[PDB]
Amino acid sequence: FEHATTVPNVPGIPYKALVERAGYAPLNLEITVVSSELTPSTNKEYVTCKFHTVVPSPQVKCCGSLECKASSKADYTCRVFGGVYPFMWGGAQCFCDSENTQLSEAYVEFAPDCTIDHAVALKVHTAALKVGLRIVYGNTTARLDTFVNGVTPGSSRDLKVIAGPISAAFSPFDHKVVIRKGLVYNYDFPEYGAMNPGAFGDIQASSLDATDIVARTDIRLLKPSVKNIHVPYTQAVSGYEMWKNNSGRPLQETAPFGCKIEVEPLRATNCAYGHIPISIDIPDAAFVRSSESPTILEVSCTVADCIYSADFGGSLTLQYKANREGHCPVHSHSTTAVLKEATTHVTATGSITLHFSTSSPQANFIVSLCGKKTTCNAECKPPADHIIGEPHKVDQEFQAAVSKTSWNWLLALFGGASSLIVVGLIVLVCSSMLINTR
Amino acid sequence: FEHATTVPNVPGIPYKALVERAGYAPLNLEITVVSSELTPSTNKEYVTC
Numbered sequence: 069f070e071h072a073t074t075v076p077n078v079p080g081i082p083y084k085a086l087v088e089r090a091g092y093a094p095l096n097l098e099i100t101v102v103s104s105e106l107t108p109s110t111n112k113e114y115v116t117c118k119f120h121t122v123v124p125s126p127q128v129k130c131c132g133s134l135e136c137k138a139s140s141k142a143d144y145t146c147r148v149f150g151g152v153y154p155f156m157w158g159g160a161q162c163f164c165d166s167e168n169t170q171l172s173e174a175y176v177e178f179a180p181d182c183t184i185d186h187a188v189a190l191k192v193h194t195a196a197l198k199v200g201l202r203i204v205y206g207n208t209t210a211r212l213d214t215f216v217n218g219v220t221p222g223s224s225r226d227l228k229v230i231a232g233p234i235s236a237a238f239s240p241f242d243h244k245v246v247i248r249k250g251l252v253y254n255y256d257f258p259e260y261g262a263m264n265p266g267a268f269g270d271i272q273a274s275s276l277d278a279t280d281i282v283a284r285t286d287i288r289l290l291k292p293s294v295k296n297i298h299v300p301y302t303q304a305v306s307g308y309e310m311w312k313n314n315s316g317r318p319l320q321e322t323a324p325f326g327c328k329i330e331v332e333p334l335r336a337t338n339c340a341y342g343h344i345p346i347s348i349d350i351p352d353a354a355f356v357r358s359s360e361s362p363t364i365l366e367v368s369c370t371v372a373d374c375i376y377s378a379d380f381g382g383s384l385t386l387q388y389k390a391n392r393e394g395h396c397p398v399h400s401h402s403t404t405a406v407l408k409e410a411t412t413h414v415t416a417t418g419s420i421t422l423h424f425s426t427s428s429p430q431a432n433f434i435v436s437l438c439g440k441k442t443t444c445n446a447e448c449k450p451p452a453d454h455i456i457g458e459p460h461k462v463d464q465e466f467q468a469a470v471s472k473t474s475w476n477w478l479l480a481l482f483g484g485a486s487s488l489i490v491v492g493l494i495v496l497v498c499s500s501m502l503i504n505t506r
Numbered sequence: 507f508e509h510a511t512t513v514p515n516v517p518g519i520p521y522k523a524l525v526e527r528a529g530y531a532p533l534n535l536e537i538t539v540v541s542s543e544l545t546p547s548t549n550k551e552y553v554t555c
C-alpha cells in the first residue's frame with residue numbers, strides 16, 4: 069500500500085503517521101530525516117595566490133645599441149636605458165662614455181608556497197538536495213538515501229520510495245564563491261581575463277601548475293641612478309594579501325539555518341528549511357490482519373498533569389478493557405500534539421501512562437488507541453525554564469494559543485447591535501402602520 | 507529546581523511544603539529551625555571595678 073505524507077525538513081524530529089486499511093489494524097509509520105545534504109553544481113574558474121617578482125639579471129650592451137623585445141611571460145615588462153654606466157665590485161664592466169645601454173625586463177610568477185596557499189574562485193548553480201531517511205514500521209527499521217527530486221526513487225531492499233520536490237528552494241551559496249584552505253567566502257571575484265591591480269585575483273591561472281598565465285599588476289621600471297649595476301622596480305601591493313586582511317567572516321558564521329559546509333564537495337549539510345512530500349510504499353505482508361489484533365473495550369483518558377513546555381514534558385494516562393494479550397498501536401490524530409511511543413502491551417483491564425508534547429496550552433484532542441478512538445482534553449501551564457537546546461515545536465503553532473477561557477471571554481464580549489437595528493426597523497414599520505391608523 | 511517559602515522563625519515547629527513539577531511526583535520538603543542565633547557587633551568602651 070502507498071501512503072503520502074508531508075514532513076518538516078529538519079533532523080532529529082521523527083514523524084508518526086498511520087495507514088488505514090479495512091480488515092487490517094493501523095500500522096505505525098515513523099519517519100526520521102537523519103541528515104540533509106545540499107550539493108550544488110560547480111565549475112572551477114581559476115586559482116590565485118601571493119605572487120613573486122622574477123627580476124632576471126639585466127642585459128647590457130657595452131658601447132653599442134640595443135632594442136627591447138616582447139615575450140610571452142605573464143606581466144612581462146621590458147625597458148631599455150641609454151647612457152647607463154654599469155659598475156660592479158670588479159669596477160667598470162663596460163667602457164664607453166654613455167654609449168653603452170642596458171635592457172631590464174621583469175615578470176611575475178606564483179610563489180612556491182602557493183602549492184598549499186592557493187585560493188580557487190568557483191561559480192555555483194543548480195543546487196540539488198539529498199535526504200537520508202529512516203523508516204520504522206511494525207518494529208522493523210529500514211534505511212534509504214534519495215535525491216529530493218520526485219522522479220528518482222531510492223534503492224533499499226529493492227524498495228522504491230519517492231520524495232520531494234522542495235516546497236521553497238533555499239541555497240546559502242551565492243553565484244560567485246571563493247575557497248581557500250578549507251574556508252568558503254562570498255565574494256564577486258573578477259571574471260577570468262579581467263585584472264585589476266591591488267585587489268583579489270590579480271594573478272589568475274587555469275590550473276595551479278599551468279605554464280600559461282595571464283596577469284597584470286602595474287609593474288613600472290625606473291631609470292638606474294646608482295653607480296653600480298641595479299634594476300629598480302616599483303609595483304603595487306599584492307592583491308591576495310589585501311583581500312586576506314579584510315576578506316571578512318567566512319560562510320560558517322553567516323549561513324542561515326545552521327548549514328554545516330564542507331569544502332571538498334563544497335556542500336552544505338544538516339540544516340533545516342521547507343517541507344518534504346513523501347510517498348512510502350509498504351509491502352502487504354508487513355500488515356497484520358485485524359482478526360489477531362488485540363480487541364479493546366471501554367477506553368478513556370486521564371490527564372494527570374500537562375506542562376506547555378518546549379521539551380516533551382506532557383503526561384497522560386489511558387484506561388482500557390480488553391480480552392486478548394498482545395501489542396496495540398497508539399497515536400494522536402491532532403497535529404498540535406505528538407506522543408512518544410507508538411505501540412504498547414495490552415492486558416484484560418490494564419491502564420498505561422504515556423508521554424506527549426504539545427504546542428498549545430489547551431491540550432484537547434483525539435487519541436487513537438489500537439483501532440479505537442477517545443476524545444479528551446485538559447489545560448497546561450507555561451514552564452519555568454524558558455531556554456533549552458533540544459528539539460522544539462514538534463508541531464508549529466496554528467494560532468491555537470488562544471485558550472478556551474479566552475475564547476469564551478471574546479464570545480461573551482461581542483453583542484448583537486445588528487439585531488438591535490433590525491428590531492428598530494421592525495418596530496419602525498409597526499409604527500408606520502400605526503401612523504396609518506393614527 | 508528552586509522553590510520559595512515563608513516560615514515562622516521558631517524552634518521545634520517543622521514546616522511541610524511540596525514542589526510541583528510536571529511529570530514528577532510531588533516531593534515532600536520539611537524545614538526545621540534547630541536554633542536561632544542573634545549576634546550583635548560590639549566594641550569595648552572601658553572597664554571598672
Ligand SMILES: *[C@@H]1O[C@H](CO)[C@@H](O)[C@H](O)[C@H]1NC(C)=O
Binds near residue numbers: 206207394
Ligand atoms: C513487532 O510487534 C509484533 C506485534 O506485537 C510482535 O509480534 C513482534 O514480535 C514484534 N517484533 C519485534 C522484533 O519486536
